[PDB]
Enzyme design. Structure first.
Site, PDB file in Angstrom:
ATOM      1  N   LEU A   7      36.678   3.463  65.087  1.00  0.00           N
ATOM      2  CA  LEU A   7      36.792   4.088  64.387  1.00  0.00           C
ATOM      3  C   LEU A   7      38.044   5.405  64.578  1.00  0.00           C
ATOM      4  CD1 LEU A   7      34.489   3.637  61.562  1.00  0.00           C
ATOM      5  CD2 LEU A   7      36.482   2.999  61.396  1.00  0.00           C
ATOM      6  N   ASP A   8      38.774   5.908  64.051  1.00  0.00           N
ATOM      7  CA  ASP A   8      40.371   7.013  63.987  1.00  0.00           C
ATOM      8  C   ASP A   8      38.837   7.858  63.874  1.00  0.00           C
ATOM      9  OD1 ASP A   8      41.803   9.049  64.376  1.00  0.00           O
ATOM     10  OD2 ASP A   8      42.982   8.225  62.983  1.00  0.00           O
ATOM     11  N   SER A   9      39.209   9.118  64.407  1.00  0.00           N
ATOM     12  CA  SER A   9      38.371  10.449  63.896  1.00  0.00           C
ATOM     13  C   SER A   9      38.728  11.272  62.508  1.00  0.00           C
ATOM     14  CB  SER A   9      39.217  11.564  64.993  1.00  0.00           C
ATOM     15  OG  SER A   9      40.667  11.347  64.767  1.00  0.00           O
TER      16      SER A   9
END
Ligand SMILES: CCCCCCCCCCCCCCCCCC(=O)OC[C@H](COP(=O)([O-])OC[C@H](O)COP(=O)([O-])OC[C@H](COC(=O)CCCCCCCCCCCCCCCCC)OC(=O)CCCCCCCCCCCCCCCCC)OC(=O)CCCCCCCCCCCCCCCCC
Ligand SMILES: CCCCCCCCCCCCCCCCCC(=O)OC[C@H](COP(=O)([O-])OCC[N+](C)(C)C)OC(=O)CCCCCCCCCCCCCCCCC
Ligand SMILES: CCCCCCCCCCCCCCCCCC(=O)OC[C@H](COP(=O)(O)OCCN)OC(=O)CCCCCCCCCCCCCCCCC
Ligand SMILES: CCCCCCCCCCCCCCCCCC(=O)OC[C@H](COP(=O)(O)OCCN)OC(=O)CCCCCCCCCCCCCCCCC
Ligand SMILES: CCCCCCCCCCCCCCCCCC(=O)OC[C@H](COP(=O)(O)OCCN)OC(=O)CCCCCCCCCCCCCCCCC
Ligand SMILES: CCCCCCCCCCCCCCCCCC(=O)OC[C@H](COP(=O)(O)OCCN)OC(=O)CCCCCCCCCCCCCCCCC
Ligand SMILES: *C(=O)CCCCCCCCCCCCC
Lengths: 56, 55, 122, 65, 459, 79, 177, 99, 128, 87, 155
Positions: free
Chosen positions: J41-43
């Site tokens: 996942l993205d930050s």
């Protein structure tokens, strides 16, 4: 005259009595808030009599 | 955790609810007249508070 | 509230000032104008302890209503008739005050027409 | 039995709070309609408001000159 | 008045012959007995003062100050016996002897019939107070505070000595009872101007007047607790007592000599109260509040109306009890945290609830909560100053804002908020400490039931 | 003690305004990854809440019935 | 800016914190959940547009005018959680959080009301006073010269040791005492 | 990224000690070990005895002093009968009927 | 575009709208790291005494004692009588005294002049 | 009022909110599924997960703590420590 | 505590400035004193004049209520900039715009109350009419004197 003024001062003295009860205490209370609620309900009932004989 | 079923809460709101229904009627019909109420006014001026509240 | 727009945005010479009127005599236009009848005695509304705003020309209905309100306790809903009598006679007094206002406005219109006729005539 | 908490769903209602809430709502509307039926003049007007422009000059004493 | 002088002197062999564990108990007991005996001075009359002898007399002005003086000694003994526990026994007896000697000087300061004997006692009270400050004070600046306390007072009082000897040579007497009847009006001259300054400036320093108050936020701060109690509660009131005795002789020049000094108090009580908004030292805050309260007494004595003198003597008695209790509260925290910095120990209501109730009561009496005699004196002074000039209510009312704003700030900073984490020696409230707080507060609350005894000779 | 959470597979956003939100997001090339988290607010017993005039007219039906009964009672009782 | 472990915020951390503050203020502006959810996905698209920007001057400039965007479009009364700073119930129970050392000041007649609790407190106090010298000598053998550089603390490296400076973290009061 | 291994280890150790502390804040079933220690009396002690005290105080100490309880004199209407005199107040003049 | 925030004395500039907040320069890294080191050394010096079981008292703060000594005792030994302090001491020290003197003097002269001419309504004024 | 949280209940609720997130397939998720390494996942997605945790449990997680909770067990342990569960 | 950790006179040489900055536990580049005009500050640092509300509340402070660490050089007005007192925190609206809006609203409302006082509303009626010479004896008129006859007629 004797009913009106008596119940008038009874309302105020009755409201002052739980302050003396909370200041003259030793024990952990058997529901002091119920005591103050009963006191103010009865002071309301007592104060209704000078109110009604003012309405009269 | 929505819960309001305490008889303290219910009765304490209930007595002020009976108040907020009937107490204006009971007090306004028990007090003596101390002024003269203005009861003659035009129809736009008699209906002003209710109309402004509805608007 | 049209009279506010007539006094403020129109002219104020024909509009009656509320603070100082009647400026015309009370007999100016009336054959044998009779006085207002005061029913309640000064001692009677003195002993009824009425408010001085309430000691007007129609306080006798108020005395009847307060005697009813005392005598019908605790049934506080039992004197609607005397209350409506006093409210109706206060209504009639308010109509009389409106008649005084309209009378003064029409006499100011008469004076305006009088001075315009005197300017146009001579 | 007291109310158990629920998760992401409608909570448990007691019969008593529902019937009391509906009873006081019906009490309010009964009182509004009842006093509107009987008084009917504290809202809509007690006495008729007369028109000053419809008054005659005879009753107000305006002699024509 | 010899029935009070001799027991106070017998307190000296009572403390110098007691056993080494017994010198606090015996002096406390018998000074409370002297304080009980002090109520016989309430034999006052509506016209005549209680005139004992050629040397001593007591009207309704000296009588409440006498009762407060004789009551303050046991309370000072209770306040001072903890921090002098490790003290040497003979120095402990010397401390008690200086307090006894100060009570002895005060109770015949207030009852001095003749004014030069008033002056000798009035200046005799310096020496035990000086010795207590400079010997049992805690910090380095007690020596400088003793120098300021000595040399503002003497620079004020030696022209008072010259002026009182001048009155002696002119009127023939300095009996106050004679000078009630032989008082001549004092006209407008420069000689009478400096007569007025010489008669007034000593008491102006002792009140203190704003601008001359600089000795006080050292002398009240650097002293020990008994020194701060007697300085705040009694020794400021020698100035007001001496003004109420000396302004009999200063009419009618006072009616235009009072104008600068009235300004100096009416602005000064705005300033010092404002100073109490930014005091980091709690004991200095109580000192500046004492200046702020005595400025009203200065105004009330200078405007010389009956309501003003009644409010001034009520406010003197009330401020004596209130400021004495406030210093005792500040000491009760200093005996724990060992610093007078007010921001250090916070959140103390979580730790000491009953002591925080005492803080609440002393704050409410400080901000003149009705019907306390603080509010009675405050209110009567405000009435008389409004009748003096109607604009002064501004400087009164603004004062009553700021007087609230430092009184509850002192209550909020010390007692409320989050408690300080790194302070862990906060012991529970000792019974001696709560006894001290109650022996201040309970007479101050009972005097609202019968305030007519603290309303001066013209109630 | 131990509380049983309901199934996560029953929270679907079809029929809710989250569906309208996801359609207006897909109309410009976006997708709604927190729809099923917000889906319970628009479902179950919290779906179909009243309007404001329906809020004010709570109990108006029984109040009107009691009103008509009391008006008929005083209309008969005068005779 | 101001952090215990790090001396600064990185650019990536500043973008993340602006993103979270923007979504909270957006939720304050966009009260209802579907309407917030729509505009929150739109704001996520606005943050996804400049995600792969390699010029750090350009990314810092875009972050700066995004802060000016946020400062123009913030809510005057944003939603604050009740126990968050600025909340309605924030630091409410701090008057009830009595520290543990006050239990040492209790009278023995009110300590005898809870025999097992104070008997169990004694071994906590004993464990603390025997761990204290080991954790002081652990701190001095591991801290670099010139003092510590960050406010981080080491863990317990040996078996039987407790982590250094642990007492007022473990024995802190509860959130609802 | 998240925690360092030293931070994870320290938080695990502090977490274990914290959960032991919070568990050890519980109570024993014997604790708190306490030392060994008329239906309408509220209407008697709080109401009726104050009505007695206040009625005695007002009747024999307050009304025995002048102007302490001063009552407004009662309202008099045309058509009343005075109790202390018997003097019938005469009724009002006949009305010019308006409706 | 957007209205620029204008910072004031009692409404300061936000942390995110300050142009020095985005400094990646090595001298600002050195300054932030040295402030971090000072703060960490003071933090360690505090909580070594704060977590001590043998310590029972007050962890004394020389910053606090230093602050109270600067607020109280250091003021006169670092005072110099110059133009600024003399004008501020005359403006704030004797200025309001002169002002309230003339106000109260004019008021009492007006009131006394009305009273001795029989003009002030002093009909029921017998408490003074 | 105020039901006490447990570690099992907090774990159930955190994994429940993460099973309602359409960027995480609910069969790969476990208590140690790292968001950037295991779940990919993205930050930004991690920030949105922590904000959903805040909306779930009703208290704000600060950013200095939000940028370090990288598996669901860290989130459960953080909510446990900030709410004092298993008293 | 001892002598060389107390506040002293204004530093002029850079070594005295460096010793002062080391005394107040801060960097030399961050240590600005007050300007040496002789107001009584000495070597005390001019901290940047912020309230303690602006401090980071999620940071673990040594004094959490004050948001202040141990050993940190306190502001000169620290007792003034507590969170119970004067706040300097950034406002959503500009300070000058707030002052202009509030002054404009208050001044416009007071101006419109002056306008409405100059032009009052009323009702198209005459004066309220009272019997007995506008109630002469009721309004406190003395009975030995006699008022002029105030007469109201029917209309
Ligand atoms: C001659 C006979 C006289 C008999 C009558 C008595 C007359 C007054 C005497 C003094 C009264 C105060 C003494 C008690 C309080 C002080 C200690 C305390 O706080 O204890 C708490 C404690 C109860 O609390 P707790 O839970 O156990 O623990 C405390 C907590 O730690 C923390 O507690 P907390 O913070 O939660 O609670 C503290 C709370 C704090 O409460 C407040 O802050 C609220 C009060 C202020 C606002 C409301 C009142 C405003 C003014 C109106 C009232 C006065 C006039 C009323 C009349 C009508 C209008 C004119 O205090 C109270 O509620 C006390 C109630 C009475 C207050 C009186 C006014 C004090 C306010 C400041 C001055 C105001 C002007 C002066 C008034 C003087 C009146 C005579 O009380 C006691 O244990 C009582 C101790 C024994 C009391 C003895 C009283 C008599 C002393 C004199 C002895 C010699 C004469 C013989 C008389 C014997 C009578 C039996
Ligand atoms: C706390 C510090 C400040 C303290 C201030 C103390 C008061 C200030 C004024 C004091 C003046 C000196 C004493 C006056 C006594 C008056 C007695 C009297 O009868 O006067 C009338 C007499 C009049 O003389 P006579 O009465 O003999 O004559 C008969 C009467 N006539 C005049 C009509 C013929 O006055 C004098 O003789 C001189 C009075 C003025 C003295 C001036 C010198 C002193 C100046 C002020 C010094 C102030 C304190 C200095 C120290 C400060 C600190 C270091
Ligand atoms: C009391 C009298 C109430 C009835 C008379 C006024 C009715 C009225 O003005 O209604 C307007 C409006 C409802 O109409 P609207 O909102 O346009 O449509 C909603 C879909 N039915 O709005 C309402 O009816 C809501 C406001 C009712 C206020 C009642 C209390 C005053
Ligand atoms: C700093 C700390 C705070 C302060 C502490 C107190 C210190 C000061 C105490 C004294 C205050 C001033 C003296 C009291 C003034 C009262 C009124 C007065 O005398 O006004 C001055 C005088 C007014 O003139 P006039 O009244 O005509 O005088 C002729 C008298 N036959 O005016 C004049 O004649 C002009 C001026 C002449 C010089 C007077 C010098 C002596 C007085 C000051 C010393
Ligand atoms: C006046 C004036 O400018 O005084 C300045 C002078 C020192 O001059 P400087 O600025 O050093 O060159 O400073 C001096 O000469 C010393 C002070 C001059 C007199 C000041 C009088 C008022 C002081 C405040 C009183 C508050 C009450
Ligand atoms: C019929 C006529 C009607 C006339 C109406 C107009 C006249 C009055 C005009 C307004 C004057 C009062 C308002 C200004 C002062 C308000 C002070 C106050 O309450 O400040 C609150 C402040 C912190 O509170 P805040 O920041 O709001 O809280 C947010 C939650 N953290 O708290 C603090 O910062 C604490 C500060 C403590 C010290 C306060 C110092 C200032 C005191 C000012 C007194 C003014 C007295 C005026 C006297 C007039 C006499 C006629
Ligand atoms: C003339 O109009 C007399 C009435 C008083 C002045 C105007 C008042 C206007 C506001 C009240 C009516 C509002 C109708 C929507």
């Amino acid at each position: 005259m004797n009913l009106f003024s008596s119940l008038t001062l009874v309302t105020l003295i009755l409201l002052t009595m739980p302050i003396a009860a909370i200041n003259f205490n030793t024990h952990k209370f058997t529901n002091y808030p119920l005591y103050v609620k009963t006191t103010i309900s009865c002071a309301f009932i007592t104060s209704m009599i000078p109110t009604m004989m003012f309405i009269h | 955790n929505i819960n309001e079923n305490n008889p303290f809460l219910i009765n304490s709101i209930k007595r002020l609810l009976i108040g907020s229904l009937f107490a204006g009627f009971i007090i306004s019909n028990n007090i003596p007249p101390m002024t003269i109420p203005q009861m003659t006014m035009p129809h736009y001026l008699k209906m002003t508070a209710l109309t402004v509240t509805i608007l | 509230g049209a009279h506010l727009a007539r006094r403020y945005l129109g002219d104020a010479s024909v509009e009656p000032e509320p603070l100082r009127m009647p400026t015309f005599p009370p007999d100016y236009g009336f054959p044998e104008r009779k006085e207002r009848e005061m029913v309640a005695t000064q001692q009677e509304m003195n002993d009824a302890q009425l408010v001085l705003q309430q000691r007007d020309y129609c306080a006798h209905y108020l005395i009847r209503f307060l005697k009813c309100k005392r005598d019908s306790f605790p049934n506080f809903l039992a004197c609607k008739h005397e209350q409506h009598d006093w409210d109706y006679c206060e209504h009639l007094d308010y109509v009389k005050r409106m008649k005084e206002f309209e009378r003064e406005r029409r006499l100011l219109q008469r004076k305006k027409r009088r001075e315009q006729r005197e300017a146009d005539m001579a | 039995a007291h109310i158990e908490p629920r998760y992401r769903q409608f909570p448990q209602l007691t019969r008593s709070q529902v019937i009391q809430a509906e009873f006081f709502s019906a009490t309010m509307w009964f009182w509004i309609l009842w006093r509107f039926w009987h008084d009917s003049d504290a809202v809509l007007g007690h006495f008729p408001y007369p028109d000053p422009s419809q008054w005659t000059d005879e009753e107000l004493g305006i002699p024509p000159d | 008045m010899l029935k009070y002088i001799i027991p106070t002197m017998m307190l000296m062999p009572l403390t110098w012959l007691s056993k080494n564990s017994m010198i606090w108990i015996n002096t406390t007991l018998h000074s409370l007995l002297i304080s009980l005996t002090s109520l016989l001075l309430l034999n006052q009359f509506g016209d005549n003062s209680l005139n004992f002898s050629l040397t001593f007399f007591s009207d309704s002005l000296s009588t409440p100050l006498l009762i407060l003086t004789m009551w303050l000694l046991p309370l000072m003994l209770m306040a001072s016996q903890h921090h002098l526990s490790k003290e040497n026994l003979a120095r402990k007896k010397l401390f008690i002897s200086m307090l006894i000697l100060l009570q002895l000087f005060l109770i015949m300061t207030f009852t001095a019939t003749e004014l030069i004997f008033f002056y000798i006692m009035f200046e005799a009270t310096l020496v035990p107070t000086l010795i207590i400050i400079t010997r049992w004070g805690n910090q380095t600046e007690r020596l400088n505070a003793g120098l300021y306390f000595l040399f503002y007072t003497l620079a004020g009082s030696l022209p008072l000595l010259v002026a009182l000897i001048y009155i002696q040579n002119t009127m023939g007497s300095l009996n106050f009872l004679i000078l009630q009847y032989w008082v001549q009006p004092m006209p407008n001259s420069w000689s009478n101007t400096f007569m007025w300054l010489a008669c007034m400036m000593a008491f102006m320093v002792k009140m203190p007047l704003y601008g001359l108050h600089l000795w006080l936020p050292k002398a009240h701060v650097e002293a020990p607790i008994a020194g701060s109690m007697v300085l705040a509660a009694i020794l400021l009131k020698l100035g007001g007592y001496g003004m109420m005795r000396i302004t009999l002789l200063l009419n009618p020049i006072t009616d235009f000599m009072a104008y600068p000094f009235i300004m100096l108090s009416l602005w000064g009580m705005i300033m010092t109260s404002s100073i109490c908004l930014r005091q980091t030292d709690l004991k200095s805050l109580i000192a500046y509040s004492s200046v702020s309260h005595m400025a009203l007494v200065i105004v009330a004595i200078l405007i010389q109306t009956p309501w003003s003198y009644m409010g001034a003597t009520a406010l003197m008695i009330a401020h004596g009890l209130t400021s004495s209790m406030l210093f005792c509260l500040a000491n009760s925290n200093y005996e724990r945290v060992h610093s007078r910095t007010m921001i250090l120990a916070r959140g103390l209501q979580t730790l000491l609830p009953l002591m925080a109730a005492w803080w609440l009561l002393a704050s409410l009496t400080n901000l003149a909560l009705p019907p306390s005699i603080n509010l009675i004196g405050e209110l009567f002074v405000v009435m008389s100053t409004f009748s003096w000039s109607n604009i002064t209510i501004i400087l009164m009312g603004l004062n009553m804002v700021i007087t609230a704003l430092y009184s509850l700030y002192m209550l909020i900073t010390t007692q409320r908020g989050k408690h300080t984490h790194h302070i862990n020696n906060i012991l529970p409230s000792f019974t001696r400490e709560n006894a001290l707080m109650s022996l201040h507060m309970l007479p101050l609350l009972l005097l609202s039931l019968n305030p007519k005894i603290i309303l001066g000779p013209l109630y | 003690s131990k509380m049983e959470l309901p199934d996560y597979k029953q929270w679907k956003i079809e029929g809710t305004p989250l569906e309208t939100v996801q359609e207006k997001l897909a109309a410009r090339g976006l997708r709604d990854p927190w729809g099923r988290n917000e889906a319970w607010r628009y479902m179950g017993g919290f779906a179909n809440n009243v309007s404001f005039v329906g809020a004010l007219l709570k109990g108006f039906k029984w109040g009107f019935a009691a009103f008509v009964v009391a008006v008929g009672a005083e209309y008969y009782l005068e005779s | 800016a101001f952090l215990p472990s790090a001396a600064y915020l990185t650019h990536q951390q500043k973008v993340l914190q602006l993103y979270k503050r923007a979504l909270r203020h957006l939720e304050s502006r966009c009260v209802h959940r579907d309407k917030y959810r729509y505009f929150a996905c739109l704001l996520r698209a606005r943050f996804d547009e400049h995600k792969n920007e390699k010029d750090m001057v350009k990314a810092t400039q875009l972050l700066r005018e995004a802060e000016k965007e946020f400062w123009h479009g913030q809510h005057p009364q944003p939603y604050i959680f009740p126990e968050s700073p600025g909340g309605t119930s924030y630091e409410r129970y701090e008057c009830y959080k009595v520290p543990e050392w006050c239990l040492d000041d209790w009278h023995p007649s009110e300590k005898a009301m809870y025999p097992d609790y104070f008997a169990k407190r004694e071994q906590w106090k004993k464990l603390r006073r025997e761990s204290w010298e080991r954790e002081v000598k652990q701190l001095q053998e591991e801290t670099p010269v010139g003092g510590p550089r960050t406010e981080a603390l080491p863990p317990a490296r040996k078996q039987g040791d407790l982590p250094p400076l642990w007492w007022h973290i473990v024995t802190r009061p509860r959130e609802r005492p | 990224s998240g925690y360092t291994p030293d931070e994870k280890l320290r938080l695990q150790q502090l977490r274990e000690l914290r959960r032991r502390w919070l568990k050890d804040q519980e109570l024993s079933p014997r604790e708190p070990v306490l030392p060994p220690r008329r239906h309408s009396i509220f209407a008697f002690t709080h109401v009726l005895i104050p009505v007695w005290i206040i009625h005695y105080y007002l009747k024999y100490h307050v009304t025995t002093k002048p102007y302490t309880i001063v009552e407004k004199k009662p309202r008099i209407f045309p058509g009343d009968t005075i109790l202390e005199t018997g003097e019938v107040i005469p009724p009002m003049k006949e009305f010019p009927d308006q409706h | 575009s957007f209205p620029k925030y204008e910072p004031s004395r009692l409404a300061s500039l936000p942390t995110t709208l300050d142009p020095a907040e985005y400094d990646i320069s090595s001298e600002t890294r050195k300054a932030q790291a040295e402030r971090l080191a000072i703060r960490s050394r003071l933090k360690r010096e505090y909580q070594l005494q704060y977590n001590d079981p043998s310590r029972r008292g007050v962890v004394e703060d020389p910053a606090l004692i230093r602050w109270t000594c600067a607020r109280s005792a250091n003021v006169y030994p670092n005072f110099r009588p110059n133009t600024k302090t003399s004008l501020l001491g005359a403006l704030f020290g004797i200025g309001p005294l002169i002002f309230w003197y003339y106000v109260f003097k004019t008021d009492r002269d007006r009131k006394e002049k009305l009273i001795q001419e029989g003009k002030l309504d002093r009909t029921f004024n017998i408490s003074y | 009022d105020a039901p006490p949280l447990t570690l099992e209940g907090i774990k159930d609720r955190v994994l429940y909110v993460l099973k309602l997130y359409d960027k995480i397939d609910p069969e790969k998720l476990s208590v140690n599924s790292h968001f950037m390494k295991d779940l990919g996942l993205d930050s930004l997605d991690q920030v949105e997960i922590i904000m959903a945790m805040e909306d779930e449990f009703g208290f704000e997680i600060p950013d200095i703590d939000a940028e370090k909770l990288m598996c669901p067990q860290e989130i459960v342990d953080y909510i446990a420590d900030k709410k004092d569960v298993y008293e | 505590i001892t002598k060389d950790m107390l506040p002293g006179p204004y530093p002029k040489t850079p070594e005295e400035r460096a010793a002062a900055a080391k005394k107040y536990n801060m960097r030399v580049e961050d240590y600005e004193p007050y300007p040496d005009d002789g107001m009584g500050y000495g070597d005390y640092p001019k901290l940047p004049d912020r309230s303690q509300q602006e401090r980071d509340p999620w940071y673990d402070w040594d004094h959490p209520d004050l948001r202040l660490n141990w050993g940190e050089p306190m502001h000169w007005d620290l007792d003034m900039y507590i969170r119970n007192r004067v706040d300097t925190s950034p406002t959503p609206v500009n300070w000058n715009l707030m002052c202009k809006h509030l002054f404009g609203f208050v001044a416009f409302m007071l101006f419109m109350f002056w306008v409405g006082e100059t032009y009052p509303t009323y009702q198209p009626v005459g004066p309220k009419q009272y019997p007995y010479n506008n109630l002469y004896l009721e309004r406190g008129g003395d009975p030995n004197k006699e008022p002029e006859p105030v007469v109201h007629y029917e209309i």
